[PDB]
Amino acid sequence: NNELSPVALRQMSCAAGTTQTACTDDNALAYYNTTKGGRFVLALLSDLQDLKWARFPKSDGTGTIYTELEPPCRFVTDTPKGPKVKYLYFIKGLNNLNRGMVLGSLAATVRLQ
Amino acid sequence: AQSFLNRVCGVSAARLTPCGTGTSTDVVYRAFDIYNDKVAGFAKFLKTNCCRFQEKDEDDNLIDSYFVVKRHTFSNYQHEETIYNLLKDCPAVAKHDFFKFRIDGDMVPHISRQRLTKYTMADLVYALRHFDEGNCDTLKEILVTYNCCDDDYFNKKDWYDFVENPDILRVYANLGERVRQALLKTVQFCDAMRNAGIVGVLTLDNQDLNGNWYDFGDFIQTTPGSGVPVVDSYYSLLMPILTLTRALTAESHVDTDLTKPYIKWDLLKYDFTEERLKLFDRYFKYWDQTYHPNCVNCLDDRCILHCANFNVLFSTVFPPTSFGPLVRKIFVDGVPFVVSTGYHFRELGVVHNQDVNLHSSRLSFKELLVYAADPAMHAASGNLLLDKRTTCFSVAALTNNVAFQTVKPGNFNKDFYDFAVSKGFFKEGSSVELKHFFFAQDGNAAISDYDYYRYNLPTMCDIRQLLFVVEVVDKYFDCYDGGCINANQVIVNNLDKSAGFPFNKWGKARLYYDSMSYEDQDALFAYTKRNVIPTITQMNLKYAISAKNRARTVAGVSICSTMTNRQFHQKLLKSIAATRGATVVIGTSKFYGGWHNMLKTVYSDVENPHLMGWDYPKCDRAMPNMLRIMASLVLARKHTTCCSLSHRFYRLANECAQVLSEMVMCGGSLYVKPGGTSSGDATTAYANSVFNICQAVTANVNALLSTDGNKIADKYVRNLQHRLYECLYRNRDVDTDFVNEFYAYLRKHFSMMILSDDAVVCFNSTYASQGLVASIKNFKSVLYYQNNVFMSEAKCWTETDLTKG
Amino acid sequence: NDALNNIINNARDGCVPLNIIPLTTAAKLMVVIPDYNTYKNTCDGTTFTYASALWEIQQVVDADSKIVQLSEISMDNSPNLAWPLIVTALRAN
Amino acid sequence: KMSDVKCTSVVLLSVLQQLRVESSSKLWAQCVQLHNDILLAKDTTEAFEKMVSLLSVLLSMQGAVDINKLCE
């Protein structure tokens, strides 16, 4: 029948912060949807509890865009790390279908308790 | 054996009768909305994986409540059971029962959904959006099962028609609250998931016509409180049905109760902005796109279409006396006028003029104009009128007695007739005979014609499909160029034509094009980018030869509207009429080999070419307002540099206030026009072409999406269908590459020749035979659900030999 | 200018829909009636009620604009009337 | 021959119209109805009866002196 996400898209390491240039360097699990008209990453995942800004340099390098995110999404994961209590952020304005695909791939290939 | 039934009906009233044959499944032909990497679409498939037992009442009579037991893999068993156990407490979830029965040496598991119904909502939506009066069995069944009519109603053949037998609406409206109940339960279900932390996509064919939900085989789990339902294909496929059945009619009742008096709103209230938001939040809670009740706050033309779609529906609740110009008492030369300082559109909400001023010393020529054109001073100073001849909301009677206008007979040219019979014409049994005359009309012929606007009903449109069709239709208009022009660049052939009301008291259009200098005309034009000027429209009978005695009538639009619409549109309108080889063939002459060139162009290279032509019944009076607004928004897509965003909205608002829902002056009285095109405005012959292309494109979309994807052999067209479904219901912003690709496909296999609602199509016969482009049944269905007219196949022609065009 | 200054001052901001100004402040009504049966459910008797007001009939004229006395609008006398009668009436107080 | 009837019905309604018959709403309604039903007929024996019925509307006035115009 109607399926959520036949073949999802994947991961990147990116920079974030709480606003403005609180942007540090690298710090976030940026789950990407790459379409060849520019990479529109979908999800942020983090072990920094409250991020409000993220930032990715444009492909030309002279520009660099900031991305504002929702409240966190609490959860806990299984791995050799033991449990991992981590926090998830949807770029505000993310429509329900993109949240759907992201959470789908998450609860599919991510250990969680 | 038979213990299977005693097990299916478990603990609750074992009044079951098998429908299958023991323990084998029961196959049916039902409409599914399915998408999963091997097929997308909204089409009738064959369901094979369900045993089905119907409950009987007492009396041993059969009742409409079935037990549907599904057989599947042993895991989907536990998956669905986990999700159900999380979701069981919702009142909008059909009761399940998971058990295991052994057929042979094999404990096979079954999922018994209980007390469900024969058809699901997808069957209703499909039956109404793919109407075919020869094959409408399931629609008749749905109608008689829920006491909307009784089978002897279908012996009244022509029952399905909207123009003949307009009582059919009263029948469809009986499904209304049933549908409405479904909507309510959907919201409950959504809330349920969002609390249980379930992520899934809701489809219309997993919810029966009571409202309950089932089928959790494709849901997954997340942390509670953070689930998310995906309701795009559900709400948007369902949208055309909400106004057909008038689902929300139980909202004008004192407490949303159909057994209670009507709400009596304050007469002076016009805002209704909080009510629209409460309606949106009550019925479309999880529709994740901003809804601006007042379309002034919209961001682009696609947001305008989106939010005006919802306004179309929510405005059927509010009292009809609260729409139209919003007047106000201003003081000019120490004397109080009543003038219009805004408007309340059913589609665009409340719009306020930006440059309104109260104490003015004296009026200019331009202000004298825009005050003599407003219906405000005219209606405020006339007698009340209750005209019981029509159903259109009458407004006022600007006189003391009604005017009854007749039509004279034509004059006979006896000399030519005698000469013709001298040359041996008009002999009995000849083929060429007289059929075109001047038919005379009696007094009440004007209004009895205006009354045809009763064929214009509030139509909601499938928004996620209209938003794609608008991209394709706009692609059909890339070859041209447009923009604003100064007052000294407009061209007016024949200045001696009437200037509308009341200007026709003092002179023809020449007087008003002479008395205002180019700077006055430009000030007037730039005034309508910050203000709404409602105008009046006369209705005139025509005196012309014809073949049918139905009276004809055209809309004389006031000079204040044409004078500005010309400057807004004429550059593009004259760049359309000056292009050869395009799809729109306005301007192309038929002489000197124009006809041959047009036909050889439309027969571009289509491989198995057939020709096809259709017909729009009552095209001008049945055209929904959403399609008129879309046509004007497509014509205004060329102003991306000359006009700003608020300017474009205020010009659209002026267009609606002047030639869509204007005040028609028929007889000697002001009535309200519900919708549809005014046939005498500045852009009729081109708005009609845009509407024509829109309907043809959506017929193609419906014909390709409603095809069993597994049966298509050309593995390029399958992928095109899959991508088309994604681009409609999964994507949210335009996908320009696929828009180009669909437009190329259409131009390859479905070439058109379009004049203002007249059309020829050269199409690939062996594709239309397989349902990969629009046939004529597709046009029939599309007009049925998107235009509220039934197009009989006696007015549509087809031709299989191209050497006779 | 007294009946319409009064309804405007009750508006919260000064704006009122146009469609209600002749409704709430017109001093003369003109009903157009196609057939006698419709005349029965509406303008019956020498006075009627509409738009939550009470109107009293005055002159009644037919399509030829000649006067009709209210006695002639019977049932069987109806086929001798030019039939879209224009019943004009005044708001009573 | 039916074409003769339709043409003369056109002429007849024209002359009725300029005799100010359209100042009697129901009379003009019946005349218009007959005229439009003659132009649509397909067998000449009902057009002829509606034609005599339509001409009677002219013969019943006193505006067109008939004996002088049958000068033959």
Ligand SMILES: Nc1nc2c(ncn2[C@@H]2O[C@H](COP(=O)(O)OP(=O)(O)O)[C@@H](O)[C@H]2O)c(=O)[nH]1
């Ligand atoms: N492999 C396989 N899967 C099936 C078959 N029939 C149904 N399914 C799956 O089981 C689910 C049944 O969906 P549907 O027909 O809508 O069931 P319903 O909504 O409960 O009536 C779908 O998600 C299918 O993918 C089948 O014959 N073979």
Ligand SMILES: [Mg+2]
């Ligand atoms: Mg299903």
Ligand SMILES: [Zn+2]
């Ligand atoms: Zn909007």
Ligand SMILES: [Zn+2]
């Ligand atoms: Zn412009």
